[PDB]
Structures are given as structure tokens and as C-alpha cells.
PDB file of all heavy atoms in Angstrom:
ATOM      1  N   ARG A  73       5.467 -26.413  -3.695  1.00  0.00           N
ATOM      2  CA  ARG A  73       6.732 -26.899  -4.210  1.00  0.00           C
ATOM      3  C   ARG A  73       7.868 -25.928  -3.919  1.00  0.00           C
ATOM      4  O   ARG A  73       9.002 -26.359  -3.653  1.00  0.00           O
ATOM      5  CB  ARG A  73       6.589 -27.138  -5.714  1.00  0.00           C
ATOM      6  CG  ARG A  73       7.882 -27.500  -6.398  1.00  0.00           C
ATOM      7  CD  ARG A  73       8.483 -28.898  -5.943  1.00  0.00           C
ATOM      8  NE  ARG A  73       9.709 -29.176  -6.703  1.00  0.00           N
ATOM      9  CZ  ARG A  73      10.876 -28.568  -6.476  1.00  0.00           C
ATOM     10  NH1 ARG A  73      10.993 -27.670  -5.501  1.00  0.00           N
ATOM     11  NH2 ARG A  73      11.961 -28.831  -7.237  1.00  0.00           N
ATOM     12  N   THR A  74       7.572 -24.614  -3.848  1.00  0.00           N
ATOM     13  CA  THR A  74       8.617 -23.611  -3.611  1.00  0.00           C
ATOM     14  C   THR A  74       8.929 -23.463  -2.117  1.00  0.00           C
ATOM     15  O   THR A  74      10.103 -23.429  -1.730  1.00  0.00           O
ATOM     16  CB  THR A  74       8.147 -22.279  -4.200  1.00  0.00           C
ATOM     17  OG1 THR A  74       7.934 -22.457  -5.612  1.00  0.00           O
ATOM     18  CG2 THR A  74       9.196 -21.188  -3.957  1.00  0.00           C
ATOM     19  N   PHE A  75       7.906 -23.349  -1.265  1.00  0.00           N
ATOM     20  CA  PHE A  75       8.122 -22.977   0.134  1.00  0.00           C
ATOM     21  C   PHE A  75       8.047 -24.150   1.109  1.00  0.00           C
ATOM     22  O   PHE A  75       8.586 -24.029   2.221  1.00  0.00           O
ATOM     23  CB  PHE A  75       7.053 -21.976   0.592  1.00  0.00           C
ATOM     24  CG  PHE A  75       7.210 -20.591  -0.007  1.00  0.00           C
ATOM     25  CD1 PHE A  75       6.091 -19.800  -0.218  1.00  0.00           C
ATOM     26  CD2 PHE A  75       8.429 -20.079  -0.280  1.00  0.00           C
ATOM     27  CE1 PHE A  75       6.232 -18.492  -0.740  1.00  0.00           C
ATOM     28  CE2 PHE A  75       8.575 -18.740  -0.835  1.00  0.00           C
ATOM     29  CZ  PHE A  75       7.480 -17.996  -1.040  1.00  0.00           C
ATOM     30  N   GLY A  76       7.370 -25.224   0.762  1.00  0.00           N
ATOM     31  CA  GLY A  76       7.214 -26.369   1.676  1.00  0.00           C
ATOM     32  C   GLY A  76       6.330 -26.007   2.863  1.00  0.00           C
ATOM     33  O   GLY A  76       5.376 -25.228   2.740  1.00  0.00           O
ATOM     34  N   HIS A  77       6.703 -26.509   4.041  1.00  0.00           N
ATOM     35  CA  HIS A  77       5.881 -26.422   5.268  1.00  0.00           C
ATOM     36  C   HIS A  77       6.815 -26.027   6.417  1.00  0.00           C
ATOM     37  O   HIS A  77       7.983 -26.485   6.456  1.00  0.00           O
ATOM     38  CB  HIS A  77       5.283 -27.823   5.564  1.00  0.00           C
ATOM     39  CG  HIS A  77       4.381 -27.862   6.776  1.00  0.00           C
ATOM     40  ND1 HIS A  77       4.841 -28.015   8.072  1.00  0.00           N
ATOM     41  CD2 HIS A  77       3.034 -27.766   6.863  1.00  0.00           C
ATOM     42  CE1 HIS A  77       3.806 -27.995   8.910  1.00  0.00           C
ATOM     43  NE2 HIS A  77       2.699 -27.867   8.195  1.00  0.00           N
ATOM     44  N   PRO A  78       6.374 -25.157   7.361  1.00  0.00           N
ATOM     45  CA  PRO A  78       5.033 -24.562   7.426  1.00  0.00           C
ATOM     46  C   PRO A  78       5.141 -23.145   6.921  1.00  0.00           C
ATOM     47  O   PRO A  78       5.568 -22.257   7.644  1.00  0.00           O
ATOM     48  CB  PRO A  78       4.725 -24.577   8.941  1.00  0.00           C
ATOM     49  CG  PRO A  78       6.114 -24.455   9.602  1.00  0.00           C
ATOM     50  CD  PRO A  78       7.178 -24.863   8.581  1.00  0.00           C
ATOM     51  N   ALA A  79       4.789 -22.931   5.664  1.00  0.00           N
ATOM     52  CA  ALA A  79       4.769 -21.550   5.196  1.00  0.00           C
ATOM     53  C   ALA A  79       3.584 -20.849   5.847  1.00  0.00           C
ATOM     54  O   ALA A  79       2.487 -21.399   5.909  1.00  0.00           O
ATOM     55  CB  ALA A  79       4.594 -21.555   3.660  1.00  0.00           C
ATOM     56  N   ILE A  80       3.787 -19.620   6.333  1.00  0.00           N
ATOM     57  CA  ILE A  80       2.693 -18.954   7.055  1.00  0.00           C
ATOM     58  C   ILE A  80       1.423 -18.843   6.208  1.00  0.00           C
ATOM     59  O   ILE A  80       0.303 -19.000   6.727  1.00  0.00           O
ATOM     60  CB  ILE A  80       3.170 -17.600   7.617  1.00  0.00           C
ATOM     61  CG1 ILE A  80       2.140 -17.039   8.606  1.00  0.00           C
ATOM     62  CG2 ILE A  80       3.518 -16.619   6.466  1.00  0.00           C
ATOM     63  CD1 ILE A  80       2.715 -15.784   9.344  1.00  0.00           C
ATOM     64  N   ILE A  81       1.589 -18.673   4.888  1.00  0.00           N
ATOM     65  CA  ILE A  81       0.471 -18.587   3.947  1.00  0.00           C
ATOM     66  C   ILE A  81      -0.296 -19.879   3.798  1.00  0.00           C
ATOM     67  O   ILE A  81      -1.427 -19.837   3.309  1.00  0.00           O
ATOM     68  CB  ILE A  81       0.938 -18.059   2.563  1.00  0.00           C
ATOM     69  CG1 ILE A  81       1.967 -19.007   1.935  1.00  0.00           C
ATOM     70  CG2 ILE A  81       1.533 -16.649   2.727  1.00  0.00           C
ATOM     71  CD1 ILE A  81       2.389 -18.604   0.517  1.00  0.00           C
ATOM     72  N   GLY A  82       0.268 -21.015   4.185  1.00  0.00           N
ATOM     73  CA  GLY A  82      -0.342 -22.293   3.839  1.00  0.00           C
ATOM     74  C   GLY A  82      -0.813 -23.143   5.004  1.00  0.00           C
ATOM     75  O   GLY A  82      -1.235 -24.300   4.798  1.00  0.00           O
ATOM     76  N   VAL A  83      -0.698 -22.625   6.228  1.00  0.00           N
ATOM     77  CA  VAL A  83      -1.037 -23.391   7.428  1.00  0.00           C
ATOM     78  C   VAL A  83      -2.153 -22.695   8.214  1.00  0.00           C
ATOM     79  O   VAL A  83      -2.530 -21.543   7.948  1.00  0.00           O
ATOM     80  CB  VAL A  83       0.169 -23.635   8.354  1.00  0.00           C
ATOM     81  CG1 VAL A  83       1.206 -24.487   7.584  1.00  0.00           C
ATOM     82  CG2 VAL A  83       0.781 -22.285   8.818  1.00  0.00           C
ATOM     83  N   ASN A  84      -2.737 -23.452   9.162  1.00  0.00           N
ATOM     84  CA  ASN A  84      -3.911 -23.014   9.917  1.00  0.00           C
ATOM     85  C   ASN A  84      -3.762 -23.476  11.368  1.00  0.00           C
ATOM     86  O   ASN A  84      -2.702 -23.982  11.780  1.00  0.00           O
ATOM     87  CB  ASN A  84      -5.151 -23.627   9.255  1.00  0.00           C
ATOM     88  CG  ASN A  84      -5.320 -23.165   7.819  1.00  0.00           C
ATOM     89  OD1 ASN A  84      -5.680 -22.006   7.565  1.00  0.00           O
ATOM     90  ND2 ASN A  84      -4.963 -24.051   6.866  1.00  0.00           N
ATOM     91  N   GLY A  85      -4.815 -23.235  12.153  1.00  0.00           N
ATOM     92  CA  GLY A  85      -4.826 -23.786  13.512  1.00  0.00           C
ATOM     93  C   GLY A  85      -3.682 -23.266  14.376  1.00  0.00           C
ATOM     94  O   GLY A  85      -3.277 -22.099  14.302  1.00  0.00           O
ATOM     95  N   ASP A  86      -3.167 -24.150  15.232  1.00  0.00           N
ATOM     96  CA  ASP A  86      -2.184 -23.703  16.226  1.00  0.00           C
ATOM     97  C   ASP A  86      -0.866 -23.287  15.592  1.00  0.00           C
ATOM     98  O   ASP A  86      -0.200 -22.376  16.122  1.00  0.00           O
ATOM     99  CB  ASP A  86      -1.890 -24.826  17.217  1.00  0.00           C
ATOM    100  CG  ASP A  86      -3.053 -25.113  18.136  1.00  0.00           C
ATOM    101  OD1 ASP A  86      -3.931 -24.251  18.287  1.00  0.00           O
ATOM    102  OD2 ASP A  86      -3.069 -26.229  18.692  1.00  0.00           O
ATOM    103  N   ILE A  87      -0.469 -23.930  14.479  1.00  0.00           N
ATOM    104  CA  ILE A  87       0.763 -23.542  13.820  1.00  0.00           C
ATOM    105  C   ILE A  87       0.621 -22.140  13.250  1.00  0.00           C
ATOM    106  O   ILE A  87       1.509 -21.307  13.434  1.00  0.00           O
ATOM    107  CB  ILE A  87       1.167 -24.539  12.718  1.00  0.00           C
ATOM    108  CG1 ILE A  87       1.501 -25.914  13.270  1.00  0.00           C
ATOM    109  CG2 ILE A  87       2.392 -23.975  11.955  1.00  0.00           C
ATOM    110  CD1 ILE A  87       1.949 -26.881  12.111  1.00  0.00           C
ATOM    111  N   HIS A  88      -0.511 -21.847  12.576  1.00  0.00           N
ATOM    112  CA  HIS A  88      -0.683 -20.499  12.051  1.00  0.00           C
ATOM    113  C   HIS A  88      -0.722 -19.488  13.176  1.00  0.00           C
ATOM    114  O   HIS A  88      -0.133 -18.418  13.054  1.00  0.00           O
ATOM    115  CB  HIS A  88      -1.976 -20.422  11.234  1.00  0.00           C
ATOM    116  CG  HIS A  88      -2.163 -19.104  10.572  1.00  0.00           C
ATOM    117  ND1 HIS A  88      -3.250 -18.291  10.837  1.00  0.00           N
ATOM    118  CD2 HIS A  88      -1.393 -18.439   9.673  1.00  0.00           C
ATOM    119  CE1 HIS A  88      -3.165 -17.205  10.081  1.00  0.00           C
ATOM    120  NE2 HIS A  88      -2.038 -17.254   9.393  1.00  0.00           N
ATOM    121  N   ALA A  89      -1.431 -19.799  14.267  1.00  0.00           N
ATOM    122  CA  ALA A  89      -1.487 -18.856  15.385  1.00  0.00           C
ATOM    123  C   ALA A  89      -0.098 -18.583  15.945  1.00  0.00           C
ATOM    124  O   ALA A  89       0.240 -17.422  16.218  1.00  0.00           O
ATOM    125  CB  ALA A  89      -2.435 -19.383  16.485  1.00  0.00           C
ATOM    126  N   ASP A  90       0.769 -19.599  15.994  1.00  0.00           N
ATOM    127  CA  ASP A  90       2.124 -19.353  16.484  1.00  0.00           C
ATOM    128  C   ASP A  90       2.936 -18.523  15.504  1.00  0.00           C
ATOM    129  O   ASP A  90       3.636 -17.574  15.898  1.00  0.00           O
ATOM    130  CB  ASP A  90       2.852 -20.678  16.741  1.00  0.00           C
ATOM    131  CG  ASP A  90       4.255 -20.433  17.290  1.00  0.00           C
ATOM    132  OD1 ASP A  90       4.359 -19.886  18.398  1.00  0.00           O
ATOM    133  OD2 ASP A  90       5.232 -20.726  16.568  1.00  0.00           O
ATOM    134  N   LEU A  91       2.875 -18.867  14.222  1.00  0.00           N
ATOM    135  CA  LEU A  91       3.621 -18.085  13.233  1.00  0.00           C
ATOM    136  C   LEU A  91       3.141 -16.630  13.177  1.00  0.00           C
ATOM    137  O   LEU A  91       3.958 -15.717  13.022  1.00  0.00           O
ATOM    138  CB  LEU A  91       3.557 -18.745  11.860  1.00  0.00           C
ATOM    139  CG  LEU A  91       4.285 -20.091  11.745  1.00  0.00           C
ATOM    140  CD1 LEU A  91       3.875 -20.691  10.426  1.00  0.00           C
ATOM    141  CD2 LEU A  91       5.811 -19.915  11.875  1.00  0.00           C
ATOM    142  N   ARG A  92       1.835 -16.395  13.309  1.00  0.00           N
ATOM    143  CA  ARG A  92       1.377 -15.005  13.367  1.00  0.00           C
ATOM    144  C   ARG A  92       1.878 -14.321  14.614  1.00  0.00           C
ATOM    145  O   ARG A  92       2.304 -13.149  14.550  1.00  0.00           O
ATOM    146  CB  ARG A  92      -0.161 -14.952  13.354  1.00  0.00           C
ATOM    147  CG  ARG A  92      -0.833 -15.268  12.018  1.00  0.00           C
ATOM    148  CD  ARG A  92      -0.538 -14.301  10.901  1.00  0.00           C
ATOM    149  NE  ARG A  92      -1.105 -12.950  11.171  1.00  0.00           N
ATOM    150  CZ  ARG A  92      -1.760 -12.208  10.285  1.00  0.00           C
ATOM    151  NH1 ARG A  92      -2.056 -12.665   9.063  1.00  0.00           N
ATOM    152  NH2 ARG A  92      -2.140 -10.988  10.667  1.00  0.00           N
ATOM    153  N   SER A  93       1.872 -15.010  15.756  1.00  0.00           N
ATOM    154  CA  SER A  93       2.426 -14.393  16.962  1.00  0.00           C
ATOM    155  C   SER A  93       3.928 -14.103  16.818  1.00  0.00           C
ATOM    156  O   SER A  93       4.437 -13.122  17.390  1.00  0.00           O
ATOM    157  CB  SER A  93       2.109 -15.295  18.177  1.00  0.00           C
ATOM    158  OG  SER A  93       3.046 -16.342  18.313  1.00  0.00           O
ATOM    159  N   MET A  94       4.622 -14.937  16.043  1.00  0.00           N
ATOM    160  CA  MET A  94       6.039 -14.781  15.780  1.00  0.00           C
ATOM    161  C   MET A  94       6.321 -13.519  14.981  1.00  0.00           C
ATOM    162  O   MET A  94       7.250 -12.772  15.306  1.00  0.00           O
ATOM    163  CB  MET A  94       6.500 -16.006  14.994  1.00  0.00           C
ATOM    164  CG  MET A  94       7.989 -16.097  14.799  1.00  0.00           C
ATOM    165  SD  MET A  94       8.398 -17.508  13.786  1.00  0.00           S
ATOM    166  CE  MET A  94       7.919 -17.014  12.163  1.00  0.00           C
ATOM    167  N   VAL A  95       5.582 -13.295  13.886  1.00  0.00           N
ATOM    168  CA  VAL A  95       5.902 -12.167  12.996  1.00  0.00           C
ATOM    169  C   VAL A  95       5.281 -10.859  13.437  1.00  0.00           C
ATOM    170  O   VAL A  95       5.757  -9.779  13.031  1.00  0.00           O
ATOM    171  CB  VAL A  95       5.503 -12.450  11.537  1.00  0.00           C
ATOM    172  CG1 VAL A  95       6.152 -13.747  11.062  1.00  0.00           C
ATOM    173  CG2 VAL A  95       3.979 -12.483  11.353  1.00  0.00           C
ATOM    174  N   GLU A  96       4.235 -10.912  14.255  1.00  0.00           N
ATOM    175  CA  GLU A  96       3.469  -9.684  14.500  1.00  0.00           C
ATOM    176  C   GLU A  96       4.165  -8.602  15.309  1.00  0.00           C
ATOM    177  O   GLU A  96       3.838  -7.437  15.104  1.00  0.00           O
ATOM    178  CB  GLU A  96       2.099 -10.027  15.101  1.00  0.00           C
ATOM    179  CG  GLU A  96       1.073 -10.372  13.988  1.00  0.00           C
ATOM    180  CD  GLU A  96      -0.224 -11.060  14.517  1.00  0.00           C
ATOM    181  OE1 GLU A  96      -0.439 -11.121  15.751  1.00  0.00           O
ATOM    182  OE2 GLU A  96      -1.030 -11.515  13.656  1.00  0.00           O
ATOM    183  N   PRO A  97       5.097  -8.882  16.229  1.00  0.00           N
ATOM    184  CA  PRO A  97       5.565  -7.774  17.105  1.00  0.00           C
ATOM    185  C   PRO A  97       6.154  -6.582  16.358  1.00  0.00           C
ATOM    186  O   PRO A  97       5.753  -5.425  16.601  1.00  0.00           O
ATOM    187  CB  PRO A  97       6.603  -8.467  17.993  1.00  0.00           C
ATOM    188  CG  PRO A  97       6.080  -9.903  18.108  1.00  0.00           C
ATOM    189  CD  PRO A  97       5.537 -10.211  16.740  1.00  0.00           C
ATOM    190  N   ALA A  98       7.094  -6.831  15.439  1.00  0.00           N
ATOM    191  CA  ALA A  98       7.711  -5.719  14.732  1.00  0.00           C
ATOM    192  C   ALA A  98       6.757  -5.042  13.759  1.00  0.00           C
ATOM    193  O   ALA A  98       7.079  -3.953  13.266  1.00  0.00           O
ATOM    194  CB  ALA A  98       8.926  -6.174  13.928  1.00  0.00           C
ATOM    195  N   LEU A  99       5.634  -5.679  13.421  1.00  0.00           N
ATOM    196  CA  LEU A  99       4.679  -5.124  12.473  1.00  0.00           C
ATOM    197  C   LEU A  99       3.550  -4.373  13.147  1.00  0.00           C
ATOM    198  O   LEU A  99       2.686  -3.814  12.440  1.00  0.00           O
ATOM    199  CB  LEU A  99       4.087  -6.273  11.647  1.00  0.00           C
ATOM    200  CG  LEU A  99       5.156  -6.988  10.812  1.00  0.00           C
ATOM    201  CD1 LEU A  99       4.518  -8.142  10.078  1.00  0.00           C
ATOM    202  CD2 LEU A  99       5.894  -6.044   9.897  1.00  0.00           C
ATOM    203  N   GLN A 100       3.494  -4.371  14.485  1.00  0.00           N
ATOM    204  CA  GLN A 100       2.374  -3.731  15.165  1.00  0.00           C
ATOM    205  C   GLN A 100       2.405  -2.236  14.879  1.00  0.00           C
ATOM    206  O   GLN A 100       3.466  -1.633  14.946  1.00  0.00           O
ATOM    207  CB  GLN A 100       2.542  -3.942  16.669  1.00  0.00           C
ATOM    208  CG  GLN A 100       1.314  -3.574  17.460  1.00  0.00           C
ATOM    209  CD  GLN A 100       1.541  -3.854  18.940  1.00  0.00           C
ATOM    210  OE1 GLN A 100       1.787  -4.999  19.329  1.00  0.00           O
ATOM    211  NE2 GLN A 100       1.463  -2.819  19.761  1.00  0.00           N
ATOM    212  N   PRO A 101       1.256  -1.598  14.601  1.00  0.00           N
ATOM    213  CA  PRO A 101       1.298  -0.164  14.237  1.00  0.00           C
ATOM    214  C   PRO A 101       2.037   0.732  15.205  1.00  0.00           C
ATOM    215  O   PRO A 101       2.807   1.616  14.762  1.00  0.00           O
ATOM    216  CB  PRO A 101      -0.189   0.212  14.057  1.00  0.00           C
ATOM    217  CG  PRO A 101      -0.818  -1.128  13.540  1.00  0.00           C
ATOM    218  CD  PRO A 101      -0.090  -2.180  14.434  1.00  0.00           C
ATOM    219  N   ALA A 102       1.833   0.552  16.521  1.00  0.00           N
ATOM    220  CA  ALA A 102       2.488   1.439  17.475  1.00  0.00           C
ATOM    221  C   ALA A 102       3.992   1.247  17.435  1.00  0.00           C
ATOM    222  O   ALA A 102       4.751   2.179  17.679  1.00  0.00           O
ATOM    223  CB  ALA A 102       1.999   1.106  18.882  1.00  0.00           C
ATOM    224  N   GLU A 103       4.432   0.039  17.107  1.00  0.00           N
ATOM    225  CA  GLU A 103       5.854  -0.229  17.034  1.00  0.00           C
ATOM    226  C   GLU A 103       6.446   0.364  15.752  1.00  0.00           C
ATOM    227  O   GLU A 103       7.462   1.066  15.793  1.00  0.00           O
ATOM    228  CB  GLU A 103       6.011  -1.772  17.145  1.00  0.00           C
ATOM    229  CG  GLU A 103       7.381  -2.343  17.148  1.00  0.00           C
ATOM    230  CD  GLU A 103       8.230  -1.841  18.274  1.00  0.00           C
ATOM    231  OE1 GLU A 103       7.707  -1.570  19.389  1.00  0.00           O
ATOM    232  OE2 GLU A 103       9.432  -1.737  18.015  1.00  0.00           O
ATOM    233  N   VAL A 104       5.793   0.125  14.617  1.00  0.00           N
ATOM    234  CA  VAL A 104       6.205   0.698  13.338  1.00  0.00           C
ATOM    235  C   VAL A 104       6.359   2.217  13.441  1.00  0.00           C
ATOM    236  O   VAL A 104       7.372   2.780  13.016  1.00  0.00           O
ATOM    237  CB  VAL A 104       5.219   0.293  12.228  1.00  0.00           C
ATOM    238  CG1 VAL A 104       5.520   1.032  10.923  1.00  0.00           C
ATOM    239  CG2 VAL A 104       5.266  -1.235  12.008  1.00  0.00           C
ATOM    240  N   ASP A 105       5.367   2.901  14.038  1.00  0.00           N
ATOM    241  CA  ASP A 105       5.443   4.359  14.163  1.00  0.00           C
ATOM    242  C   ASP A 105       6.648   4.843  14.962  1.00  0.00           C
ATOM    243  O   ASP A 105       7.053   6.006  14.784  1.00  0.00           O
ATOM    244  CB  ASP A 105       4.125   4.853  14.780  1.00  0.00           C
ATOM    245  CG  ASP A 105       2.994   4.870  13.768  1.00  0.00           C
ATOM    246  OD1 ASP A 105       3.280   5.014  12.572  1.00  0.00           O
ATOM    247  OD2 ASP A 105       1.788   4.781  14.155  1.00  0.00           O
ATOM    248  N   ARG A 106       7.206   4.023  15.857  1.00  0.00           N
ATOM    249  CA  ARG A 106       8.363   4.436  16.655  1.00  0.00           C
ATOM    250  C   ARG A 106       9.633   4.607  15.817  1.00  0.00           C
ATOM    251  O   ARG A 106      10.477   5.449  16.149  1.00  0.00           O
ATOM    252  CB  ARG A 106       8.646   3.440  17.784  1.00  0.00           C
ATOM    253  CG  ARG A 106       7.652   3.549  18.935  1.00  0.00           C
ATOM    254  CD  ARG A 106       7.747   2.368  19.915  1.00  0.00           C
ATOM    255  NE  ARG A 106       6.558   2.420  20.768  1.00  0.00           N
ATOM    256  CZ  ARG A 106       5.728   1.412  20.998  1.00  0.00           C
ATOM    257  NH1 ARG A 106       5.954   0.205  20.488  1.00  0.00           N
ATOM    258  NH2 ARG A 106       4.674   1.616  21.781  1.00  0.00           N
ATOM    259  N   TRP A 107       9.794   3.840  14.745  1.00  0.00           N
ATOM    260  CA  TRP A 107      11.078   3.772  14.066  1.00  0.00           C
ATOM    261  C   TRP A 107      10.995   3.762  12.552  1.00  0.00           C
ATOM    262  O   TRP A 107      12.051   3.734  11.908  1.00  0.00           O
ATOM    263  CB  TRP A 107      11.909   2.554  14.565  1.00  0.00           C
ATOM    264  CG  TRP A 107      11.117   1.268  14.713  1.00  0.00           C
ATOM    265  CD1 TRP A 107      10.717   0.670  15.888  1.00  0.00           C
ATOM    266  CD2 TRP A 107      10.629   0.421  13.665  1.00  0.00           C
ATOM    267  NE1 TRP A 107      10.047  -0.490  15.631  1.00  0.00           N
ATOM    268  CE2 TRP A 107       9.957  -0.658  14.283  1.00  0.00           C
ATOM    269  CE3 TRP A 107      10.711   0.453  12.263  1.00  0.00           C
ATOM    270  CZ2 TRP A 107       9.354  -1.679  13.564  1.00  0.00           C
ATOM    271  CZ3 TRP A 107      10.083  -0.594  11.535  1.00  0.00           C
ATOM    272  CH2 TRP A 107       9.418  -1.641  12.203  1.00  0.00           C
ATOM    273  N   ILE A 108       9.799   3.762  11.952  1.00  0.00           N
ATOM    274  CA  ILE A 108       9.730   3.584  10.505  1.00  0.00           C
ATOM    275  C   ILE A 108      10.413   4.730   9.771  1.00  0.00           C
ATOM    276  O   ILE A 108      11.101   4.518   8.763  1.00  0.00           O
ATOM    277  CB  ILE A 108       8.288   3.327  10.013  1.00  0.00           C
ATOM    278  CG1 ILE A 108       8.289   2.822   8.554  1.00  0.00           C
ATOM    279  CG2 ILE A 108       7.384   4.607  10.171  1.00  0.00           C
ATOM    280  CD1 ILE A 108       8.995   1.502   8.421  1.00  0.00           C
ATOM    281  N   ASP A 109      10.266   5.967  10.268  1.00  0.00           N
ATOM    282  CA  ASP A 109      10.876   7.082   9.556  1.00  0.00           C
ATOM    283  C   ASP A 109      12.397   6.993   9.563  1.00  0.00           C
ATOM    284  O   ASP A 109      13.054   7.166   8.517  1.00  0.00           O
ATOM    285  CB  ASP A 109      10.441   8.373  10.217  1.00  0.00           C
ATOM    286  CG  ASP A 109      10.751   9.564   9.361  1.00  0.00           C
ATOM    287  OD1 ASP A 109       9.991   9.795   8.408  1.00  0.00           O
ATOM    288  OD2 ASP A 109      11.761  10.242   9.630  1.00  0.00           O
ATOM    289  N   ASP A 110      12.974   6.725  10.731  1.00  0.00           N
ATOM    290  CA  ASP A 110      14.422   6.624  10.838  1.00  0.00           C
ATOM    291  C   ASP A 110      14.963   5.422  10.087  1.00  0.00           C
ATOM    292  O   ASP A 110      16.154   5.402   9.759  1.00  0.00           O
ATOM    293  CB  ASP A 110      14.857   6.522  12.301  1.00  0.00           C
ATOM    294  CG  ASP A 110      14.863   7.867  13.013  1.00  0.00           C
ATOM    295  OD1 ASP A 110      14.740   8.921  12.347  1.00  0.00           O
ATOM    296  OD2 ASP A 110      14.971   7.838  14.255  1.00  0.00           O
ATOM    297  N   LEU A 111      14.135   4.420   9.808  1.00  0.00           N
ATOM    298  CA  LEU A 111      14.578   3.308   8.986  1.00  0.00           C
ATOM    299  C   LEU A 111      14.549   3.691   7.519  1.00  0.00           C
ATOM    300  O   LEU A 111      15.568   3.595   6.823  1.00  0.00           O
ATOM    301  CB  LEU A 111      13.691   2.070   9.215  1.00  0.00           C
ATOM    302  CG  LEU A 111      13.944   0.860   8.293  1.00  0.00           C
ATOM    303  CD1 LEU A 111      15.346   0.323   8.552  1.00  0.00           C
ATOM    304  CD2 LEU A 111      12.879  -0.245   8.609  1.00  0.00           C
ATOM    305  N   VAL A 112      13.374   4.117   7.037  1.00  0.00           N
ATOM    306  CA  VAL A 112      13.175   4.182   5.589  1.00  0.00           C
ATOM    307  C   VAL A 112      13.726   5.465   4.998  1.00  0.00           C
ATOM    308  O   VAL A 112      14.302   5.450   3.908  1.00  0.00           O
ATOM    309  CB  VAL A 112      11.685   3.982   5.227  1.00  0.00           C
ATOM    310  CG1 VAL A 112      11.431   4.111   3.729  1.00  0.00           C
ATOM    311  CG2 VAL A 112      11.220   2.666   5.696  1.00  0.00           C
ATOM    312  N   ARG A 113      13.557   6.596   5.678  1.00  0.00           N
ATOM    313  CA  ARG A 113      13.922   7.864   5.052  1.00  0.00           C
ATOM    314  C   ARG A 113      15.416   7.959   4.730  1.00  0.00           C
ATOM    315  O   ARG A 113      15.751   8.387   3.614  1.00  0.00           O
ATOM    316  CB  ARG A 113      13.391   9.046   5.886  1.00  0.00           C
ATOM    317  CG  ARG A 113      13.208  10.288   5.063  1.00  0.00           C
ATOM    318  CD  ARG A 113      12.506  11.443   5.834  1.00  0.00           C
ATOM    319  NE  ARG A 113      11.176  11.064   6.301  1.00  0.00           N
ATOM    320  CZ  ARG A 113      10.076  11.138   5.537  1.00  0.00           C
ATOM    321  NH1 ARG A 113      10.173  11.604   4.292  1.00  0.00           N
ATOM    322  NH2 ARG A 113       8.885  10.820   6.021  1.00  0.00           N
ATOM    323  N   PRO A 114      16.338   7.502   5.580  1.00  0.00           N
ATOM    324  CA  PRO A 114      17.759   7.558   5.197  1.00  0.00           C
ATOM    325  C   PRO A 114      18.084   6.615   4.066  1.00  0.00           C
ATOM    326  O   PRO A 114      19.020   6.885   3.295  1.00  0.00           O
ATOM    327  CB  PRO A 114      18.482   7.153   6.478  1.00  0.00           C
ATOM    328  CG  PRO A 114      17.495   7.507   7.550  1.00  0.00           C
ATOM    329  CD  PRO A 114      16.160   7.138   6.991  1.00  0.00           C
ATOM    330  N   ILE A 115      17.371   5.485   3.993  1.00  0.00           N
ATOM    331  CA  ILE A 115      17.589   4.547   2.896  1.00  0.00           C
ATOM    332  C   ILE A 115      17.133   5.156   1.570  1.00  0.00           C
ATOM    333  O   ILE A 115      17.842   5.075   0.550  1.00  0.00           O
ATOM    334  CB  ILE A 115      16.870   3.219   3.203  1.00  0.00           C
ATOM    335  CG1 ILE A 115      17.641   2.459   4.269  1.00  0.00           C
ATOM    336  CG2 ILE A 115      16.746   2.356   1.925  1.00  0.00           C
ATOM    337  CD1 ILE A 115      16.853   1.267   4.886  1.00  0.00           C
TER     338      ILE A 115
END
């Protein structure tokens, strides 16, 4: 009732695979390590 469709938490199959491919790049560990300190520490 709150999020509707296609919330990443509520879908499967090809839609879930696409949404995971969508969100994953900035979350990849090697990517996070490049910039996480300069993001969070000044904040």
C-alpha cells in the first residue's frame, strides 16, 4: 500500500534482476572505497 510496484523489495525475476543491476554500481565495494571517506567524513 505504501510503495506499490515495482518496489525492489517486492519483485522477482527479470524485473528484480534489472532493478538490482540499476542500484548496484554505486554500491559496489571497490567503488565505495574510492569516495566514501570524502563523502561522509566532511558531513
Side-chain angles (χ1 to χ4, degrees):
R73 174 66 178 75
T74 300
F75 289 150
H77 182 276
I80 192 171
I81 62 175
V83 297
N84 299 288
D86 290 340
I87 295 182
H88 185 241
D90 182 64
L91 293 169
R92 287 296 294 224
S93 83
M94 188 183 74
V95 305
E96 276 166 10
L99 297 177
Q100 192 178 299
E103 182 59 33
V104 172
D105 283 333
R106 285 168 193 129
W107 44 253
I108 193 63
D109 194 78
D110 281 349
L111 173 64
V112 177
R113 204 173 300 276
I115 286 167

